[PDB]
From a paper:
Pyruvate carboxylase (PC) is a tetrameric enzyme that contains two active sites per subunit that catalyze two consecutive reactions. A mobile domain with an attached prosthetic biotin links both reactions, an initial biotin carboxylation and the subsequent carboxyl transfer to pyruvate substrate to produce oxaloacetate. PC is mostly found as tetramers of four identical subunits, with monomers of ~120–130 kDa in size. This enzyme possesses a tetrahedral geometry with the tetramer organized in two layers. In this work, we study the structure of Lactococcus lactis PC (LlPC) during catalysis in the presence of positive allosteric regulator acetyl-CoA.
A focused classification with a mask around the CT domain produced: a class with no substrate CTempty; two classes with pyruvate CTpyr; a class with BCCP inserted at the active site CTreact; and five classes with oxaloacetate CToxa. The cryoEM maps of these catalytic states show local densities that define the nature of the bound molecules with high definition, and also large differences in the degree of openness of the CT domain, being very open in the CTempty class, intermediate at variable degrees within CTpyr and CToxa classes, and highly closed in the CTreact class with bound BCCP domain (left panels in Fig. 5 and Supplementary Movie M2). During the transition from CTempty to CTpyr or CToxa, the 825–935 region, a subdomain of the funnel, closes and moves closer to the active site. The loop 608–618 of the TIM barrel also moves with the funnel. The main catalytic residues of the CT domain are placed in a TIM barrel (residues 525-780). This region is very well-resolved in the volumes, allowing the identification of most of the side chains, ligands and even some water molecules.
Author numbering: 460 to 1000
The structure:
């Protein structure tokens, strides 16, 4: 692999890394290796391996402390580093995390945007990352973010593709599947929940939080809605109930109220996921801890705060002498955090910039990722000045869309509309009047055609016809209409294309990212395993 490696090194030395400025290669010291005090603690991963998922949920229930999930490997750098954290950097500290923090309920290391980004921009396989980390991290439960009826892709897939993906992901190491739907619609969740149960893994059924349950002017997503959705989620056999707060909208008094009402509505342990965008993540988690939440999502201090999760280290001290403590070795966590502080410096080209708590997110409930994508695709098309009012436009088109849940990929729908109207000086009242000739963004017509599922309360019918002029509108699961996929023929059609017989993970990767996977194969032909280079060499030559 010498010739491939020198070819890549020459390419980056001379033409720079695509998508970032050709900064000169900097001198970096070796990241600090942690000094750890180690104990053998019989992690939840061991319980799952030995006695199944029901044993794990019994363990979670009988834990007095609040358990932690480390999001450093997925959501922290999705929020902060544009999902660019490389496997080479993970593997330098994976064993330290696994051995030094056995108290961790799980590490969220897969799913979300990482699957697409690894292939597309890092030229490393997500499956390879999962395999290497699983070998390095044998005692920590691995958690993935699963998007309901579309596993890690965007388009809806037939059910067999989803089930085969779940089986392969569970065979290759994933233990906990946080399954969610972009509109909190059960029919998109239940099949994949069943598949996770059948593969012997833990199913986390997720309710996306939106709006404000303690504000009576927004009764659509009131607390009763959350309780009913929770009851029905518990009716599907999900092992855990997660409460995804993708935008950090959950506020401390609502979190305590919400968790407590869910707590006496269902019997599943509750997993709380919040983002620190508003600066209230720690107090929200503390409020949920009082209500009796079981697991909370945190990130290491160096990749925490801002649009990421609240700090793993700070939440410990926030609870140190209260009735409920955090289950973590905080001294070991502080040592591991030194490694992450240092390797973050390699990812300077991907940093967002000066970050301070922003409560504007309470008004524009756009998640952090959707926030950067609107920074990256408003100014780039000449509207960076107006970004502070397209945020207001984002607020408006959500209300005209019927006040929908804004998480991937439904948050891309709202942003596409709002950016489109500002791009054409369209107010709300003209799209109802001059809307019969406008060409709405593809993501908007597809959403109003039912391709993302059915939102709560349906569509604003009059507005829907204005959008989907002469197109079929479906009202059932989009996957029910999905074109059938036969894996054996996909294996044949792929083997002829990549030059070798693919494993079962490469087949599903090809199915859910056809062009991306094949573009990754081309680059592996040209450059080979660029995943083995260190980040400064990978990025700057
Ligand atoms: O916060 C969101 O929009 C959900 C998320 O992490 C993903 O699905 O990649
Ligand atoms: Mn998140």
């Amino acid at each position: 692999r010498g010739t491939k490696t020198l070819h890549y090194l020459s390419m980056i030395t001379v033409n720079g890394f695509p998508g970032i400025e050709n900064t000169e290669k900097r001198h970096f010291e070796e990241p600090r290796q942690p000094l750890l005090n180690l104990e053998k603690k019989k992690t939840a991963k061991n319980i799952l391996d030995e006695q199944g998922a029901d044993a794990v949920v019994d363990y979670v229930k009988n834990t007095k402390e609040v358990l932690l999930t480390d999001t450093t490997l997925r959501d922290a750098h999705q929020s902060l580093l544009a999902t660019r954290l490389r496997l080479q950097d993970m593997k330098g500290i994976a064993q330290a995390i696994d051995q030094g923090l056995p108290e961790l309920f799980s590490a969220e290391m897969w799913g979300g945007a990482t699957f697409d980004v690894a292939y597309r921009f890092l030229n490393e396989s997500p499956w390879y990352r999962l395999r290497k980390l699983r070998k390095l991290m044998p005692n920590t439960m691995f958690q993935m973010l699963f998007r309901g009826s579309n596993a890690v892709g965007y388009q809806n897939y037939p059910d067999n593709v989803i089930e085969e993906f779940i089986r392969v992901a569970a065979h290759e190491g994933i233990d906990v599947f946080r399954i969610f739907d972009s509109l909190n619609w059960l029919p998109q969740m239940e099949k994949s929940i069943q598949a996770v149960r059948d593969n012997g893994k833990i199913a986390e059924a997720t309710i996306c939080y939106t709006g404000d349950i303690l504000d009576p002017s927004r009764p659509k997503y009131n607390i009763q809605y959350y309780k009913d959705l929770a009851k029905e989620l518990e009716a599907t056999g999900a092992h855990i109930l997660a409460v995804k707060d993708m935008a950090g909208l959950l506020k401390p008094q609502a979190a305590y109220r919400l968790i407590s009402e869910l707590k006496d509505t269902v019997d599943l342990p509750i997993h709380l996921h919040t983002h620190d965008t508003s600066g209230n993540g720690i107090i929200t988690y503390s409020g949920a801890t009082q209500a009796g939440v079981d697991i909370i999502d945190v990130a290491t201090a160096s990749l925490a705060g801002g649009t990421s999760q609240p700090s793993m280290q700070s939440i410990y001290y926030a609870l140190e002498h209260g009735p409920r403590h955090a289950s973590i070795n905080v001294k070991n966590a502080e040592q591991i955090d030194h490694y992450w502080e240092d390797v973050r410096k390699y990812y300077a080209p991907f940093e967002a910039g000066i970050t301070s708590p922003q409560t504007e997110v309470y008004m524009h409930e756009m998640p952090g990722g959707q926030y950067t994508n609107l920074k990256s695709q408003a100014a780039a098309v000449g509207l960076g000045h107006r970004f502070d009012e397209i945020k207001q436009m984002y607020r408006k088109v959500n209300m005209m869309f019927g006040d929908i849940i804004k998480v991937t990929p439904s948050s891309k729908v709202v942003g596409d509309m709002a950016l489109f109207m500002i791009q054409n000086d369209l107010t709300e009242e003209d799209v109802y009047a001059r809307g019969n000739e406008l060409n709405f963004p593809e993501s908007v017509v597809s959403f109003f055609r039912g391709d993302l599922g059915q939102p709560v309360g349906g569509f604003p019918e009059k507005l829907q016809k204005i959008i989907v002029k002469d197109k079929a509108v479906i009202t059932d699961r989009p996957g029910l209409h999905a074109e059938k996929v036969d894996f054996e023929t996909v294996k044949a059609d792929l083997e002829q294309k990549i030059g070798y017989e693919p494993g079962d993970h490469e087949v599903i990767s090809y199915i859910m990212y056809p062009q991306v996977f094949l573009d990754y194969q081309k680059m592996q032909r040209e450059f080979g395993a660029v995943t083995l280079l260190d980040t400064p060499t990978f990025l700057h030559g």
